[PDB]
Amino acid sequence: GLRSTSYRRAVV
Amino acid sequence: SHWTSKVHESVIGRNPEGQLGFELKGGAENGQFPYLGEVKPGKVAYESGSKLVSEELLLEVNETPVAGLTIRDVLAVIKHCKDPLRLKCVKQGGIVDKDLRHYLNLRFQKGSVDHELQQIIRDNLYLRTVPCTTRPHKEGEVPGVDYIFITVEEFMELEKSGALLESGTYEDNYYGTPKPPAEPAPLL
Numbered sequence A: 001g002l003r004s005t006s007y008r009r010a011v012v
Numbered sequence B: 001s002h003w004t005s006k007v008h009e010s011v012i013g014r015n016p017e018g019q020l021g022f023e024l025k026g027g028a029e030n031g032q033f034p035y036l037g038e039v040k041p042g043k044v045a046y047e048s049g050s051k052l053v054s055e056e057l058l059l060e061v062n063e064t065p066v067a068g069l070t071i072r073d074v075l076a077v078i079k080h081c082k083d084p085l086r087l088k089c090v091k092q093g094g095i096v097d098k099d100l101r102h103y104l105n106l107r108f109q110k111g112s113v114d115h116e117l118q119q120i121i122r123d124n125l126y127l128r129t130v131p132c133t134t135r136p137h138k139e140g141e142v143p144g145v146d147y148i149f150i151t152v153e154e155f156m157e158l159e160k161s162g163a164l165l166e167s168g169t170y171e172d173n174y175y176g177t178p179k180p181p182a183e184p185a186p187l188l
Helices: A005-010 B071-080 B100-104 B113-127 B152-160
Strands: B008-013 B024-026 B034-036 B057-061 B085-090 B164-170 B173-178
Touching: A005 B164, A005 B173, B024 B071, B057 B071, B100 B113, B100 B164, B152 B164, B152 B173
Parallel strands: none
Antiparallel strands: B008 B085, B024 B034, B034 B057, B057 B085, B164 B173
């Protein structure tokens, strides 16, 4: 499902 | 120089049997782009435009991006598309490869065509995957839906065995995405 803000920051 | 520099559109029709003339390989459940099998000259009913070499990566079908999906989902997109099928493809070679983990680790300049495509492919991958994390569960979160909550030791085992397609860190924890399963649980 849609990734959270913390996830997106982690895999940027 | 760009990953997308050799991208092109090839327009085909389905054969009398209803097949494409080549096989589809790869898909995210195998950690890969969807890509074509061997393309034998004469087997593909081309309409007009460029032709295909063996093993090109398949990026879009009739403007629906399919890179990042499983083979099952890619074939489902094709099932619901009407001839003619406009396929966006890029031949493998140089920086372009079917390996999704290697591709998701590439860093493209933000706003570039290469970057936009990478993010579309990530969105497709996220459609059928739940991220795993080593941070603890929080109020409101559904394990196995919001996250797979695993230990650092388990996370590193998944990394070492190549099960994770992308990973990162944030506030003292590891975050990652494993391959989606090959066949999903039946919905009906």
